[PDB]
């Protein structure tokens, strides 16, 4: 697992994220409906702009990004399920929760690879990316009555 | 089918087609790549809106969107392709209009279906995309050096 | 029923409807009074502009639009009731939802109406307003915890 | 009168009055169409404005503000009437000043209770929309040639 | 057929901003303020709807008129050299009122067709002509449909 | 006491109430975060604008504000308490609510004292607040399920 | 007469004449009241800023510009009448346009003199100058049923 | 001495304090220029904002306003002087200074005047003019590094 | 006389903006997008050039062409009806050039009479039509004055 | 100490610091007021905003950030004074730069403290602060006529 | 020399002029280092313009401009100085007004010479900013305390 | 060398790299004209910014920059060549990717070396310069036919 390939790996993620954050975004009922209606779109704008930026360091740096929903899914440790059985407000922030601590946690592991490879760039484009995504754990766990690292 | 199914297709392609549009963007080179870079980015909003609008119609109506990868590649008429063999400029836009041409042939379809079925604001809406369509297969024929129905 | 006495109809329920609105507007309580206070703002304004636009579109045809609170109230089907005994978020929301799913049945008709004296104009206006309150409908009816048509 | 009534009665008043805006905005015709209704707009959003501010003052001392087209009808002392003969712009005009002229009056009154009754909150609210009526009371006098207090 | 209206249309379009700039010009009266200005907010909206109709034209298959030559050969509005403002006004209602009518032929010859999207097109225009004839007419003191 | 010597007094509590509001907008946790963590940060911005308005007019007046933590903490009315038990949204909003309540009787003393010795603009400019107290009172008690007085 | 006093007689006469401004601004009444009250706020700032630039210029060439009242009085050729016999808007328009007029031709003198002495900066700022008092002749006299050079 | 005299007092006073504003904007000279001028720039669009605003509330009442450079000469206890030898930057903002307070003082005794009369507006008006000077005050005292009642 | 001229540009500048509304709908290329908008550009510019003349025309007393029978009749700028990239924009810096010789008359013309504003005017607007000359001919490969 | 107990000693530090910004920007005096008045408002601006980041940075980490007066003054390494005896603006600025020195100072020793325990956002987010400080120390320095170290 | 060779030495000198812009910018100190400091980013901004302006001005009429710092050194009649030891923040400012003189008189040869070679937009172009560069020479020169022409 | 000496030598070559912009942005000929044109601009901005920032950054730490052409062309390793011979866009591109390939790999250099030197702020604004000059690298190779590190 060298950068390159760490950066197509969170290209995958991000494509499978974002098509979660819509699903969030089109089933959620409940009193909290038109607060997190709104919210997830701009997790969505968010998110979709990491990823472009992530694809484009991939290719400064000489890769080429995975470009097709085939690769996102069998690439991506981030997991998706369709829709089924209705969910409360509080279930689908709890999906989303625990995606945003994979990924915290993923950018915990390239932040460390890049320090590895002597890759500064990348490095401190994932560091801000991170400082996002904390904000976002604590914010969200705040919702659902819990520390963020709870 | 029914209007619920014809718009729950349309978001499974047109998460599809704005992979796709991603893919050209990342992957394009030649002389025209400043205008054409920033032209992706431009149809990759504009139809990231008409999923998003297409899916709260279908919730709108009583339907179910697609909301999964998995789901997009099993019900989506547009076809993708991995990057290997290094294409042209040419040839990722004619990929592009090509697509263009698909969904406006299928929302062809949908616009008498949804006539037939009564329903006054689905049918409006396709029209309206069908609109933008139509001018974006005229430019970027335009581009290549060809008419819009060549 | 003609055009003319269609639009003049929708005029009354109208101004009753902005009425209501600023009635749940103002009188409101629970713990979703500030994203419901504010979402009232946004529905006194759309729906006012309607009005306007309804108004207009009956005077462009040749009509003679109600212009008091005197024939609003004796055309209105659209029903109001003062505000005695408290009443919770939900109650004051499904009032709402229950005006926006009478006005859509109503612009049902009137579409229907339009397309056959061949009013083209406010036909495609009729439509343009359905579509935003079967939005609505959706989101107020995800809020209270119900799917759209339920 | 007290304070709380005083407040109810304009907001009866403002309703009456924002709907005869839009009938002169409607029914207007003359050589002065283009500049006068747009004015109406303007006259239509500040009194509208001004309703609401009433509204939410005495929703903040403890008051119930009427809410119904029935209740505004009940309580106004502003006068309405259908359009059923033609009439000028002066006479429109005329009707409009005659209103300006009654809310500031009433106004005064208002003014001169709150002073009294000590609530300095509603007394300045008050004062300004006066400054307000009496520079709209000039401006429409000398459209129709005569002096503010003529 | 589509191609021919929406080619004719733009003919007259192009006949129509030039006399909205005729009336902008030599304008004079009380209203001159408010409706010369008025005439440049109408020379934007025709202009776009020409390049609308044009673009749409061209997204079809078609050709554009693309000459002062062409536009007259094939316009029906009619123009005049170089009046008090009723009589520019009413210059102004004629051609909107011709402009709307010959419209709800292409809305009809385009349902026909088969042609949803300059259908749509047409009747969009179409609702804000009617607005224009409204307010127009109610500045000459008439009603719009007389 | 007078007119200095009250400003004086409320730019300590002014002081002690923003902390307060910081406070509240750090450890507030539930449902309602979103709404209610933006909501404190538009108090923290008006009510620290009220603050220099009051320090400012003072030194307008020959004044000289207080303007240290330790000055703040021994002049202010207003209490604050460390944070060890966690508490809720609606126990937050209490003390907001109850401290809002706080300087709105504060500003009724100086509101009348300051007309008494004749300094009409502090009196206009106390006026003027007291009037946004009284509607984030409205609003905030309306949140907790309350009436205004309650 | 040389470049410096033309200057600071131009000075003159634009304090002059946007007092005239003001009157008209104030004065007027007649069915155009609200077009022209509105227009006169136009040309008042216009001309405050020519004023401002004049003098600045006058300044940067090594002049001393009028800053008082009493210097306008004596040194002006644009001359005022206070108000006591009510006027028609077409005659405060009619004394407007003498004064445009009388500007126009001052101007025309200015530009010549500068040209001979050399001034080319000046010179071209009383060209723009007097292509927007042009614009302004021809306009109002328009507006009073004239030709430009009538 | 009634408010419409009064006002048309002030209406002479305002003309001859912008002028003079002008007259300190152009003549300054030291290190503060550069701040200085724009500052006079802001106070001599203020000021000559509460010109137009008295001026029109004058109107307002029936009153006619002073229109001439003559009548504000002859009505202004405003004292102004030609600009003959340099003047230090503390000079000039004393003379700055020192009209302002007049101008303070002078709308202190109107506020009292049009308490007596009952004006509530003029009174409102009056003072809100009032907070902006005595703001000025303290911060050119400041500035000439004494206290505002210095 | 400053009348004759100023009109026979108002005659130029209507035949001109259709020239420009011509390209900017038939154009085709790799240039497509780029020179599409830059023709919108163009378009609102010379349109504003074009009002800007009329309204000068009038204030001096004047009476500006105002139908397209009288600007096919009096304009010196050539219009054909309907190309590669190069050849539209040939076309384009033909009547630029046109233009900016015919306006270096004006000038002269002007300052003859005596007429300063109308002088400046022309003036502003040739150093506009003089940057785009320079920056169309290097897209064409070539030096402003080749 | 750990970065928990250093960013919570940050807050305590921040909130000592705007109150002292506050104090600079309502006592100064002297020619540079009106620069220096508003530098302080942008000063108070951006260090409020740094101490709200770090607040909630700190909570992000699962800490407890200070939120009283009390607490701030307990655990602040700057120092307050109150103002008894009148000091220059050369004075009020050096106790700024001198303090702004100590903040700079302190976060030198969180930058490596954070690097060191491997925390790479709190890192980032403490050079970014101390990149404007060390700005801010050159800038005011130079106002003083010193080097920036010096 | 003819147009061409005037407008490249103009090239050259306003190159060096914003270099020497720059190295006031960066090294001034002295009380009124904010304003200026901010003063010299406005200056580099507009004679950036002007440069960029004049060398396309040349490219316009046949020409070809200097296009390498070694070329600008070779032909700027502008003379620059290593900074070496503390200046004061007058004497920058006097070497700013005498190269604002320098470019002054240089273009008043330019305008002489262009008016005589017929290239009227030149002409133009020179005298406008002209203009601007007599607006800044009496602007810095009162700033220094001095005349504009002394 | 150390930090202060590299930031220096950076100042020099970010002075000749935008004058070399400008040589591109003056001389280009081709089909690519416009859109290239107005990248320079673009490119003359940002890199124009940096310098600032570099010198500033200088300043920050006790250094002098570089503030004459003749100091820049004495220190930089950027090269720059009159235009005597006609070029092709290509070969323009070619040179300036080659000069965004020195820049990068002195940054890269600088980055290390203020690792070393402990410097934490100068460290990450050349890592943040260095992340949009690797972007400018992929998108101009791609616009040659070319990978980025090819
Ligand atoms: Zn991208
Ligand atoms: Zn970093
Ligand atoms: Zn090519
Ligand atoms: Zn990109
Ligand atoms: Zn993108
Ligand atoms: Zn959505
Ligand atoms: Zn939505
Ligand atoms: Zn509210
Ligand atoms: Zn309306
Ligand atoms: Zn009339
Ligand atoms: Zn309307
Ligand atoms: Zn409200
Ligand atoms: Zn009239
Ligand atoms: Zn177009
Ligand atoms: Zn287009
Ligand atoms: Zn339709
Ligand atoms: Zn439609
Ligand atoms: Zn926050
Ligand atoms: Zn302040
Ligand atoms: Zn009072
Ligand atoms: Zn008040
Ligand atoms: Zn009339
Ligand atoms: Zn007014
Ligand atoms: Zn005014
Ligand atoms: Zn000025
Ligand atoms: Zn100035
Ligand atoms: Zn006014
Ligand atoms: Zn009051
Ligand atoms: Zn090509
Ligand atoms: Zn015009
Ligand atoms: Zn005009
Ligand atoms: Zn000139
Ligand atoms: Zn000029
Ligand atoms: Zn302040
Ligand atoms: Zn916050
Ligand atoms: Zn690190
Ligand atoms: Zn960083
Ligand atoms: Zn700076
Ligand atoms: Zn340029
Ligand atoms: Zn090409
Ligand atoms: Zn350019
Ligand atoms: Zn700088």
Same mark, same amino acid.
């Given at each position: 697992?060298?950068? +390159?390939? !760490?950066?197509?790996?969170?290209?995958?993620?991000?494509?499978?994220?974002?098509?979660?954050?819509?699903?969030?975004?089109?089933?959620? &009922?409940?009193?909290? !409906? !038109?607060?997190?209606?709104? +919210?997830?779109?701009?997790?969505?704008? $968010?998110?979709?702009?990491?990823?472009?930026?992530?694809?484009? &360091?991939?290719?400064?740096?000489?890769?080429?990004? #995975?470009?097709? /929903?085939?690769? !996102?899914? $069998?690439?991506?440790?981030?997991?998706?399920?369709?829709?089924?059985?209705? *969910?409360? %407000?509080?279930?689908?922030?709890?999906?989303? =929760?625990?995606? /945003? $601590?994979?990924? &915290?946690?993923?950018? +915990?592991?390239?932040? $460390?690879?890049?320090?590895?490879?002597?890759?500064? =760039?990348?490095?401190? %484009?994932?560091?801000? #990316?991170?400082?996002?995504?904390? *904000?976002?754990?604590?914010?969200?766990?705040?919702?659902?009555? +819990?520390?963020?690292?709870?």
């Amino acid at each position: 697992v060298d950068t +390159k390939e !760490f950066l197509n790996h969170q290209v995958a993620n991000l494509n499978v994220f974002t098509v979660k954050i819509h699903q969030i975004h089109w089933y959620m &009922r409940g009193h909290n !409906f !038109f607060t997190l209606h709104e +919210k997830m779109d701009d997790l969505y704008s $968010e998110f979709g702009e990491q990823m472009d930026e992530v694809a484009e &360091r991939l290719l400064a740096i000489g890769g080429s990004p #995975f470009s097709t /929903l085939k690769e !996102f899914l $069998e690439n991506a440790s981030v997991e998706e399920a369709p829709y089924t059985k209705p *969910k409360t %407000m509080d279930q689908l922030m709890e999906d989303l =929760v625990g995606t /945003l $601590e994979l990924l &915290r946690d993923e950018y +915990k592991q390239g932040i $460390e690879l890049t320090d590895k490879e002597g890759d500064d =760039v990348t490095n401190d %484009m994932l560091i801000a #990316f991170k400082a996002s995504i904390d *904000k976002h754990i604590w914010m969200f766990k705040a919702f659902l009555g +819990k520390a963020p690292l709870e």
